[PDB]
Design a protein around this nucleic acid. Structure first.
Lengths: 83, 84, 215, 136, 25, 126, 99, 64
RNA sequence: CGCAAGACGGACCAGAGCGAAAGCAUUUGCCAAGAAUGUUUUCAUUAAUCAAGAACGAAAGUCGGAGGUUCGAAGACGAUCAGAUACCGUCGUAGUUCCGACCAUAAACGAUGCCGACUGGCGAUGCGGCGGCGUUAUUCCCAUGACCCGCCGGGCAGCUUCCGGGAAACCAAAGUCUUUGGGUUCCGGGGGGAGUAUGGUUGCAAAGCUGAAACUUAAAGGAAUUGACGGAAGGGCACCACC
């Protein structure tokens, strides 16, 4: 299958960063934002996107911060903007 | 076969796409080429299927490379046939 | 034995994992109480402790099982040390299937310390992007490159980098993932795992180096 | 029977080592390590007929006792390891594999995990029966 | 099997004749 | 049980509905007495059968068309579907344009009007 | 004459093959004449699945599957009835019947 | 065994089995759990909706 | 949980590949060999098939050494059977394995000689070469990789039919045959007697190769069709069948 509790993406992301790999740790983060896990803003989607945009600016990937926010606004649409 | 087809006069490449010794007249499928890149400022003439390294007298000392058929040239244009 | 009440003469214990694991409480065992003909610790050391990875690392993954040996006992807590990792059967079986070419290689390798390891890896060919073909078979020349390059990566990252840093790279599988991209040009490949590692030799106990892991 | 001093919110996990196939069923509950162990019961002990040792109910009746002595001690949960005979043999579970699980689970014991373990060669020694094999 | 046996009974019989003639001389 | 109708019933049942379609009701007893007058059925038990099947057919004939026998009003509506359908009077919508490689044929056959261009990607299933 | 054209299941262009053993006749046949049946089942089997799954200590934990590769011979295939006699014009299929 | 006498009722009849049709497969609802169901072999003529008297639900049917 | 010994290369492994045939699957290196394709290179008829003669040739067997886990002729037991020297269960020698010599046989079967020419269609697969609207790898960019489409060789095969042939089964060859002739080798003459007799030759042994007659008999044998029968398969049915 893949994931569950989409909160596991952070763990991997965190696990790869302790080695020093931000290229795949991020991939894991993006592999979630875009998937069946489109349940519009679970509470864990903010820490995922906060880490995602830190690594985007820690490696320099705008076109990824676009797809990331583009997914985020959607799930956080006619729902919660405070996020 | 439609079992009535002409064989005297064939199509330019729809009946000359065949194997070269199954044509009415035997033709090669190879050609020469007049080159003259910069690495070696001279008008060299080289066969398409090089089979061996062609040397250069300039700064370079390689022009070709023999592969399993035609020959991979290099970063120097220089092209012609001419005629055959 | 057939001593009267032979599970009321046994003594419970606990088994503690290294600090690298988020949950360190492995579980519990028991040995018989001390006699002068054979003491508790001598019948308690040299065991193996199969533990999962998604159970020792809360939590999700369902394999990459690790073996851990009790090298020391300390006052009702049994401290463990790495012994080698293995993989499940079903995962290893499911990936193997018709119309693929399986790719395998191993190396014997030494750490920066005195530990010695013998790693076993695997690759599988990709069922490609938009085949209409019903095969994914590869040439023999291409395979022997992929095996050569799967050894080159797995020696570089394990010959340098001490015992603990090896483990840290294998838990997210950074090792296997690195090979998947590095071989991609000569054939795309989906899957890399390290089905076994077998700790062959190991150095002296070294109490100072020991307690670093359980710090 | 003395268990550990806490098991209130946690569980204690044993390994069940269910044996499979024909003319025999074992259930042999052990430690996590498997170094030491507890009670061991066979279907040849529950039922004597020399032909119902692999039967479903003989495997169920076995585990229906073994699962009591587990909870009596303090072992409450079980990881499961399977074993079919293998070694260039049938390498396929018997009847009494499905059976014992259904009985022991509903007796009250918890199930933690389950897996297949079978000794499968990478090609090894010749099998008994000869070239023409058994017939009749 | 049948033909292979008919060839076998006659083989051992032929061998016996050889021995019996070698015995006679 | 059993009692699956024979062919002698099903042969004459169709015939009797075709040529005396008007006389039929949908009641058993009325359809019996009609069959008694428009024909003679030489048994009594046979008569009670042929009526009942004539009734059972007449139920279905008041829905879509049966494929074993014909009546007039169905051949009317047949003709009404088969001389004009309301979908089109135009041929087909009067102007339809085509993509290139058809335009190249038309270029070499003296036609040069009413076209569009789209040069859709390679290739089959790809 | 011949009741086949392959005269086996395939031996085209090859002089010899390594043989393999039946699982329940204990017989010996070629690899490329043996009936090759691969099998997929769940470990626990689907009758007691509800009674087991509720009694799990966890939640998200798909169950393993049981992967076995079986090679049967000519006689032990027909007897266990994974194959049967077929008509003269109906032996020319290579196609597995759908599920 | 040491289980007390259970009661469970038919939901549906499946078909007849045995080597003379003497056994009948049947599906039964446990009559205390409405999502629980076991298959049984029952000897006598049964209709549907009638209740049985099981001595155990450990036993389960699979064939003739 | 550790150690030792011998054997063996699973799944992956396929109407896939290579080899004259017999045959040939764990890693890496070394040693020599070969096919196909590419070529506006070289030689200039150097070829085809084959008495004599020569190399290789499964398994079993024989001789001398090493080894002997596993399986296992022989043999000893236990059952089943009226009998049971068998099928089945236990034990177990030779053998099975390796090294050096012998042995030359198999349903060594595609039961189909080798070389050459001509005569339908269609879709695939392995290898080489060539042509191309594009996705895809990386260093950012036509090094050469993967996937897609088409073309040209030779190779293992398949599907299709009033090509034509055949007694039919079937076969793009078993076709191009009373309209009979491309080249050449081997081999057959009703069924038994008999692969026996006999002499020759080879082999340590076991046997191999070469191979008759007297006498006897009107059938033996091939393909296909219709029935009956089956301790064959799939359906259906009966209180003279069962529950």
């Amino acid at each position: 299958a893949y994931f569950q509790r989409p909160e596991n993406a952070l763990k991997r992301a965190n696990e790869f960063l302790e080695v020093g790999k931000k290229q795949p740790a991020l991939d894991v983060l993006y592999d979630v934002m875009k998937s069946k896990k489109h349940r519009t803003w679970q509470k864990i989607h903010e820490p995922i996107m906060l880490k995602y945009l830190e690594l985007c600016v820690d490696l320099r990937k705008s076109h990824l911060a676009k797809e990331g926010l583009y997914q985020y606004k959607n799930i956080c649409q006619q729902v919660n903007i405070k996020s | 076969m439609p079992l009535a087809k002409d064989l005297l006069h064939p199509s330019p490449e729809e009946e000359k796409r065949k194997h070269k010794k199954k044509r009415l007249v035997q033709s090669p499928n190879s050609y020469f080429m007049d080159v003259k890149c910069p690495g070696c400022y001279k008008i060299t003439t080289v066969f398409s299927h090089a089979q061996t390294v062609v040397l250069c007298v300039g700064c370079s000392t390689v022009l070709c490379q023999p592969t399993g058929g035609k020959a991979r040239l290099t970063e120097g244009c220089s092209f012609r046939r001419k005629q055959h | 034995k057939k001593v009267v009440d032979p599970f009321s003469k046994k003594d419970w214990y606990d088994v503690k994992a290294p600090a690298m694991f988020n949950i360190r409480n492995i579980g519990k065992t028991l040995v018989t109480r001390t006699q002068g003909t054979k003491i508790a610790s001598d019948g308690l050391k040299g065991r193996v402790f199969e533990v999962s990875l998604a159970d020792l690392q809360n939590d999700e993954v369902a394999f990459r099982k690790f073996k851990l040996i009790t090298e020391d006992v300390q006052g009702k807590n049994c401290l463990t040390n790495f012994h080698g990792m293995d993989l499940t059967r079903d995962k290893m079986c499911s990936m193997v299937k018709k119309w693929q070419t399986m790719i395998e290689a191993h190396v014997d390798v030494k750490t920066t310390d005195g530990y010695l390891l013998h790693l076993f890896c695997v690759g599988f060919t990709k069922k490609c992007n938009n085949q209409i073909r019903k095969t994914s078979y590869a040439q023999h020349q291409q395979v022997r490159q992929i095996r050569k390059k799967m050894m080159e990566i797995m020696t570089r990252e394990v010959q340098t980098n001490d015992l603990k840093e090896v483990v840290n790279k294998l838990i997210p599988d950074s090792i296997g993932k690195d090979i998947e991209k590095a071989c991609q040009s000569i054939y795309p490949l989906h899957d890399v795992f390290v089905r076994k590692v077998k700790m062959l030799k190991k150095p002296k106990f070294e109490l100072g180096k020991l307690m670093e892991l359980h710090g | 029977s003395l268990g550990p001093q806490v098991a209130e919110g946690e569980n204690v996990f044993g390994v069940c080592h269910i044996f499979a196939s024909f003319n025999d069923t074992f259930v042999h509950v052990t430690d996590l390590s498997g170094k030491e162990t507890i009670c061991r019961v066979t279907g040849g002990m529950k039922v004597k007929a020399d032909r119902d040792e692999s039967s479903p109910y003989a495997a169920m009746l076995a585990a229906q006792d073994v699962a009591q002595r587990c909870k009596e001690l303090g072992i409450t949960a079980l990881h499961i390891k399977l074993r079919a005979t293998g070694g260039n043999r049938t390498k396929t579970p018997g009847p009494g594999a499905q059976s014992a699980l259904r009985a022991l689970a509903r007796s009250g014991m918890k199930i933690g995990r389950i897996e297949d373990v079978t000794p499968i060669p990478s090609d090894s020694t010749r099998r008994k029966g000869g070239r023409r094999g058994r017939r009749l | 099997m049948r033909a292979k046996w008919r060839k076998k009974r006659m083989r051992r019989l032929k061998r016996k004749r050889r021995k019996m003639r070698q015995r006679s001389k | 049980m059993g009692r699956v109708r024979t062919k002698t019933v099903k042969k004459a049942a169709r015939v009797i509905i075709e040529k005396y379609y008007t006389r039929l009701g949908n009641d058993f007893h009325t359809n019996k007495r009609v069959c008694e007058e428009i024909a003679i059925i030489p048994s009594k038990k046979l008569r009670n059968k042929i009526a009942g099947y004539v009734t059972h057919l007449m139920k279905r004939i008041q829905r879509g068309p049966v494929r074993g026998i014909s009546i007039k009003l169905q051949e009317e509506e047949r003709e009404r579907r088969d001389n004009y359908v309301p979908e089109v009077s135009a041929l087909d919508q009067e102007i339809i344009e085509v993509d290139p490689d058809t335009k190249e044929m038309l270029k070499l056959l003296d036609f040069g009007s009413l076209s569009n261009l789209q040069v859709t990607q390679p290739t089959v299933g790809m | 004459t011949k009741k086949r054209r392959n005269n086996g299941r395939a031996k085209k262009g090859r002089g010899h093959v390594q043989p393999i053993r039946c699982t329940n006749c204990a017989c010996c046949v070629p690899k490329d004449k043996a009936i090759k049946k691969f099998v997929i089942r769940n470990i626990v089997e689907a009758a007691a699945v509800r009674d087991i799954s509720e009694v799990s200590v966890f939640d998200a934990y798909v169950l393993p599957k049981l992967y076995v590769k079986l090679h049967y011979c000519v006689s032990c295939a027909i007897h266990s009835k994974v194959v049967r006699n077929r008509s003269r014009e109906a032996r020319k299929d290579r196609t597995p019947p759908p599920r | 065994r040491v289980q007390p006498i259970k009661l469970a009722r038919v939901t549906k009849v499946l078909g007849r089995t045995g080597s003379q049709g003497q056994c009948t497969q049947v599906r039964v609802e446990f009559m205390d759990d409405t999502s629980r169901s076991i298959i049984r072999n029952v000897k006598g003529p049964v209709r549907e909706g009638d209740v049985l008297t099981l001595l155990e639900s450990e036993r389960e049917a699979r064939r003739l």
